[PDB]
Amino acid sequence: KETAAAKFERQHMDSSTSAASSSNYCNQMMKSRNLTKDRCKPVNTFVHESLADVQAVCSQKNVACKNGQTNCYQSYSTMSITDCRETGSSKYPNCAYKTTQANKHIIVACEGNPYVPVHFDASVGPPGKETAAAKFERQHMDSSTSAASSSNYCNQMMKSRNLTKDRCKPVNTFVHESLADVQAVCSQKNVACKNGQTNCYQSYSTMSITDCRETGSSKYPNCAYKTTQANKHIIVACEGNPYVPVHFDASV
Ligand SMILES: [Cl-]
Numbered sequence: 001k002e003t004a005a006a007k008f009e010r011q012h013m014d015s016s017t018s019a020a021s022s023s024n025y026c027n028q029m030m031k032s033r034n035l036t037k038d039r040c041k042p043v044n045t046f047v048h049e050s051l052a053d054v055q056a057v058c059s060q061k062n063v064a065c066k067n068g069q070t071n072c073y074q075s076y077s078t079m080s081i082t083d084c085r086e087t088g089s090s091k092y093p094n095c096a097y098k099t100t101q102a103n104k105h106i107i108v109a110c111e112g113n114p115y116v117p118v119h120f121d122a123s124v125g126p127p128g129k130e131t132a133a134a135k136f137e138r139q140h141m142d143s144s145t146s147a148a149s150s151s152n153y154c155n156q157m158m159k160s161r162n163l164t165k166d167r168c169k170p171v172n173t174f175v176h177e178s179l180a181d182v183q184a185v186c187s188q189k190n191v192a193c194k195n196g197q198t199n200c201y202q203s204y205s206t207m208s209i210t211d212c213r214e215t216g217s218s219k220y221p222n223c224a225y226k227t228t229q230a231n232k233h234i235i236v237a238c239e240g241n242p243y244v245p246v247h248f249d250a251s252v
Pocket residue numbers: 171172173248
């Protein structure tokens with residue numbers, strides 16, 4: 001019995017190759033993945049990224065699924081993908097496909113514990129624009145993992161969350177807790193923010209966090225960071241309706 005997560009890998013994952021080289025790619029891949037067994041599946045997308053990279057998308061930009069569900073996620077980075085579209089002259093069982101390569105952001109539906117991709121929803125071309133709450137999640141939320149695995153966490157994460165694009169962002173914290181726990185902080189201990197405003201809140205509880213701080217020798221575009229893992233209360237500024245985090249003020 002194939003799990004939903006496994007069916008997604010079969011139908012949509014192709015890590016073991018960087019892109020759709022040949023124009024016959026789809027022809028071969030659609031066949032080997034059993035997508036032409038009962039019929040020539042009209043269209044399909046393959047993602048040429050590591051499983052972990054695609055799996056991390058489940059902790060990225062939350063967006064509305066095409067089907068009306070809320071469990072879809074758009075990747076912060078563009079990915080190598082291949083769209084396969086059946087040709088007009090394709091006849092089963094010799095299904096024929098036009099192979100199309102692109103670099104785009106992907107949108108997947110995620111499910112389960114662990115929380116992994118179970119459907120491919122769409123692809124989105126460059127670029128896009130961001131809400132305060134969305135930006136907070138990109139810069140400061142890492143729900144996927146329980147903590148840092150090494151001291152290379154920050155080098156990887158700072159880059160993949162686009163925090164080293166124009167310059168090296170010097171200091172930035174990531175919170176390894178659920179979104180609901182972090183959002184709940186907006187209703188916890190009210191405190192003043194560093195800037196003197198009073199829409200800041202300190203979590204009642206310590207949380208698993210990671211402090212990314214650029215090294216003193218680091219220089220753009222070669223941004224180097226030290227990774228420090230810790231358990232501290234966070235302090236966030238909250239705004240809007242719903243009343244959610246929009247700035248990471250400090251941890252204490
Ligand atoms: Cl920060």
